[PDB]
Amino acid sequence: AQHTESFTSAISATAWSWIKVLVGGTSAFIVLGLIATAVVALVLFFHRH
Amino acid sequence: DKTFPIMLNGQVNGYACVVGGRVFKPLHVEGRIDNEQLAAIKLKKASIYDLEYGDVPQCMKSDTLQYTSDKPPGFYNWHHGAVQYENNRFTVPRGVGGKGDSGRPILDNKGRVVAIVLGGVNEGSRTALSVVTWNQKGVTVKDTPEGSEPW
C-alpha cells in the first residue's frame, strides 16, 4: 500500500451520523433527567416558601 | 375511631390517622397498625414528607377526617389538648407530647385536620412541633424547626 491507514479512515459520513446521534441522544436524555430533577427540587422549594 | 396506634412489640410507637380519604403514618414509626383493615394496605413511601400513605378501604371510607388549608392564627385542638399556632409556627407547652405522639392530627374549631405532627423542638417554656401542613394554596409541605427530634 502506498498510503497509511488511520483509526478513523474507515468511518463514513453515515457512520459518524449514527455515532453522533447515539452519543447526542443518550447525552441529551441524561441531561433532560438531571434538569427535570433540579427543576422539581425548585418547585418543592417554592411550595414551602 | 379515626386514629389508630402503631405498635411494634406491644408498645405504642406512633399513631395513624385517616385524612381526606388516605391513611397517614410517619416513615420513622415502626410496627403494625392495630386495625388489620389498614395494616394490610400497601403504603407508598413519600420520603419527601416522611409519610406513608394508601387508599382507605371501601369498608373504612366512612372513618375519614375532613382537612382544610385555612389555618388562621389561634388555638387548635389535639389529643393532648390545645395547640397554639402563630407566625407560621405550631407550638405546645413544654412536656405536652413526646416520643410516640408522631402522626397525631391537629383539628380546628370545626373538627377539620390542619396538620400532622412528626416531632418537635423544646424552646424553653414551649415546644415547637414539626408538622406536615398545606400552604395558602393547599399544597402539602413539611415544616421542620431546626433540631426537631422525630417523635
Q: Assign 3-class secondary structure to chain A.
A: CCCCCCCCCCCCHHHHHHHHHHHHHHHHHHHHHHHHHHHHHHHHHHHHC
Please tell me if residue B142 touches chain A, with a CB cutoff of 8 Å. Answer: yes
From the candidates A45, A46, A47, which should be mutated to test the interface with B, based on the most B CB atoms within 10 A? A47
- Which set of grid coordinates corresponds to residue B116? 400532622
- Per the annotation, the verdict on B130 as an active-site residue is no
Question: E-strand spans in chain B?
Answer: 3-7, 12-19, 22-26, 32-33, 44-46, 51-55, 74-78, 81-86, 89-93, 105-107, 113-123, 126-134, 140-143, 149-150
Cα(B68)–Cα(B5) distance, rounded to whole angstroms?
Answer: 23
Q: Give A48's contacts in chain B (Cβ within 8 Å).
A: 135, 141-143
Experimental method: cryo-EM
Instruction: For the beta carbon of residue B6, count every other beta carbon within 10 angstroms.
Output: 23
Region class of A3: left (phi > 0), else alpha (psi between -120 and 50), else beta: beta
- Per the annotation, the verdict on B1 as an active-site residue is no
Question: How much helix, strand and coil, in percent to the nearest 5, is found in chain B?
Answer: 5, 50, 45
* Record: contact A47-B48, CB cut-off 8 A: no
Strand B12-19 with B44-46, pairing:
unpaired
Phi and psi (nearest 5°) for B18?
Answer: -105, 110
- Which set of grid coordinates corresponds to residue A1? 500500500
Q: Give A47's contacts in chain B (Cβ within 8 Å).
A: 135, 139-141
Please tell me if residue B141 touches chain A, with a CB cutoff of 8 Å. Answer: yes
Q: Which amino acid makes up residue B5?
A: P
Cα dihedral angle (A29, A33, A38, A40), rounded to 10 degrees?
130
Cα dihedral angle (B31, B142, B101, B13), rounded to 10 degrees?
10
Which residues partner with B141 through β-bridges?
B133
Q: Give A46's contacts in chain B (Cβ within 8 Å).
A: none
3-state secondary structure (DSSP) of residue B39? helix
Indicate the DSSP class of residue B69: S
Cα(B136)–Cα(B88) distance, rounded to whole angstroms?
Answer: 11
3-state secondary structure (DSSP) of residue B45? strand
* Record: contact B135-A44, CB cut-off 8 A: no
Q: Which of B65, B25, B139 is nearest to A49 (CA)?
A: B139
- Per the annotation, the verdict on B50 as an active-site residue is yes
Instruction: Judge contact between B79 and B106, C-beta under 8 A.
Output: no
